[PDB]
Amino acid sequence: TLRDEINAILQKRIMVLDGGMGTMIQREKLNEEHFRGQEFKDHARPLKGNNDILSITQPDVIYQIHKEYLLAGADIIETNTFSSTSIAQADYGLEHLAYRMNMCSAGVARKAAEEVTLQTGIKRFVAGALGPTNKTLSVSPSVERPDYRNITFDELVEAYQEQAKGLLDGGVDILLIETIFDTANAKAALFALQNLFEEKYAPRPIFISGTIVDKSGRTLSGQTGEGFVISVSHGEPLCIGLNCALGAAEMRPFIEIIGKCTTAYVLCYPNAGLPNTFGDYDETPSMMAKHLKDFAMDGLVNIVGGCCGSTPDHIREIAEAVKNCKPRVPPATAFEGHMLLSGLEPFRIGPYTNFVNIGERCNVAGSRKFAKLIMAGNYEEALCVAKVQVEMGAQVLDVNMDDGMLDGPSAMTRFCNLIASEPDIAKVPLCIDSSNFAVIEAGLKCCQGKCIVNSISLKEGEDDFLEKARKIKKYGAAMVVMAFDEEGQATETDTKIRVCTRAYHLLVKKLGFNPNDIIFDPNILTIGTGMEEHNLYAINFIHATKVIKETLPGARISGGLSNLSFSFRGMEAIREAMHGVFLYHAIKSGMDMGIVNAGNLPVYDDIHKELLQLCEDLIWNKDPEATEKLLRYAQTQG
Ligand SMILES: CN1c2c(O)nc(N)nc2NC[C@@H]1CNc1ccc(C(=O)N[C@@H](CCC(=O)O)C(=O)O)cc1
């Protein structure tokens, strides 16, 4: 296929990609009438600056620019489709022409590429450019309305699907998602491409490139380079990297950081310097070539090019500068064995990582204050619960909106839109928790980075479990599997182990799920209720954790720690002691994380030895009188 050829080429030499088409068009200096051409002379809206209309109104200009860039030593050419989406063309009243526009852009690029290939023999590739669109999905249009978004995930998916249909019909060699101001739009584009690649179309190599705004190392949406790489890696892009907004000097540390994270190839095409007082990117090709040669000699990049200001002369010098340099060797084992999550910043859970706290208080069912604020519609104050949880050591936030008095998906969407408006709350990943999959999907469609999906199980059969897991894998998030199957909840140790193994071997084999993104939950259940059957639950959970961690490679273990101490509600000291004692054994067992009250967990040495011993008898069933002995001890505190 085409991906095999591109991979073979990238393993031997550095590939040169396009340049400043948007500036070469300004060098033509077309007026209003050239934009209209023959067909759009009757159009009632001005097409000034619509660089994508030239694929039909002035095809010769675009073809000649492609030819000049191609003879300037370039190897990959972007199609003239930066704003050819139905949303970007809305400012010009050409919503209905996106498919035709993309077909004609692909054709006019393909003719030039084929002619140059016939001239030189060196095969040239055409990359379909998917624009970021002026609409942002993670950034509110207005500061006063943080939860408001003027575009949704489904609309963006539909528009990008419409664009990529025309691109694929035209026969583009590569699909390129570039100048990403918001990685959520990149995820939507990947979603549309994944729909297309299974509905009719054969797969294509996928190129992704972000845009770092300034020296902060963060995109316009606030996410850093590692977070971006983690967020968009679920689509398995052949190449990732940066472009624009920074020269070849300021971009080097971020390219280093990104190349240290991804196992895919690194593509870098920056600006041609900085804007002068006259508005021109005046860095001569001599400095650009030497800077890209410095990038290549160190082994930072595998594809080089140029952003705005890169005339074909810049590409002509660069293709000679990087002619002899060896390609970058990717870190084929980059963070092997780790679990990669992301918010505005990367989050990693490796073999040596300590116990990971997941905040429980962002739960309508489980939290009193959060539920009281949510039913009142005061999400503005409800964000403070997540803020305080993060301030108290919670590394992931668990969001649950399941209630019969609330519209699930709408509340979940509003809260996930409000979360992204605050940086420190948004830098930690989210755990999307709901018994309804329509709420999990709504939560995933709003998240910027890579999140965790909670409460999926084998309850409704193997087929439904596989369908849900396939949808989640397409969404690219983490997944918590409950110990629940067709026969009911798993209470015994062997039942938990059987259910978890059956879930694991379906995901890994039938679906090809990533083994490091599976988080089994052996269903921590309440003890101390005074019922005989409610005594062994901690023991079965611990033994099942041991057995699962010792036999399922990569799979993590979590649990609802607060569920264990339901019988002692109101006696918060005993609840904290029980949580600490249970954690001391679960972490030793292999419990990687859990939905825990992050700020209310004590160290195993602090707990009073009498209370610690009583919790030990109750948890480990060392004494049938422990459940009453604990209450008897509690009554002494009055
Ligand atoms: C059901 N359980 C659970 C689970 O067992 N497994 C998974 N994967 N996920 C989850 N998520 C929900 C739940 C764990 N979350 C909880 C569990 C218990 C509580 C709780 O007891 N809250 C106290 C109030 C505490 C407060 O007001 O802050 C109460 O009296 O209800 C609060 C949150």
Numbering used by the authors: 17 to 654
Provide excerpts from the study:
Methionine synthase (EC 2.1.1.13; 5-methyltetrahydrofolate-homocysteine methyltransferase, MTR) forms a crucial node connecting the methionine and folate cycles in one-carbon metabolism. MTR catalyses the methylation of homocysteine (Hcy) using 5-methyltetrahydrofolate (MeTHF) as the methyl group donor, to generate methionine (Met) and tetrahydrofolate (THF). MTR is a ∼140 kDa monomeric protein comprising a catalytic N-half and a cofactor binding C-half ([Fig fig1]). The N-half consists of two rigidly linked (Linker 1) TIM barrels, known as a homocysteine (Hcy) domain and a folate (Fol) domain, which exclusively bind the substrates Hcy and MeTHF, respectively.
To overcome this, we screened and collected data in the presence of MeTHF, reasoning that it would stabilise MTR^FL^ as found in our thermal shift experiments. Initial screening resulted in separate 2D classes of both halves of MTR. Despite multiple processing strategies no classes showed the concurrent presence of both halves of MTR. A larger dataset was then collected which allowed us to determine a 3.1 Å resolution structure of the 70 kDa N-half bound to MeTHF and a 2.8 Å resolution structure of the 68 kDa apo C-half ([Fig fig1], Supplementary Fig. 3, 9, 10). The N-half structure of MTR^FL^ confirmed that the Hcy and Fol domains are TIM barrel folds with the short Linker 1 (Pro347 to Phe371) that tightly locks the domains side by side ([Fig fig1]). This arrangement implies that large conformational changes are required for the Cob domain to interact with the N-half domains during catalysis as has been suggested for bacterial MetH. On the other hand, the Fol domain showed clear density for the MeTHF ligand ([Fig fig1]) making interactions with the conserved residues Asn470, Asp537, and Asn579 through its pterin ring containing the methyl group. Additionally, the p-aminobenzoic acid (PABA) side chain of MeTHF forms hydrogen bonds with the residues Arg384, Arg585, and Arg591 ([Fig fig1]).
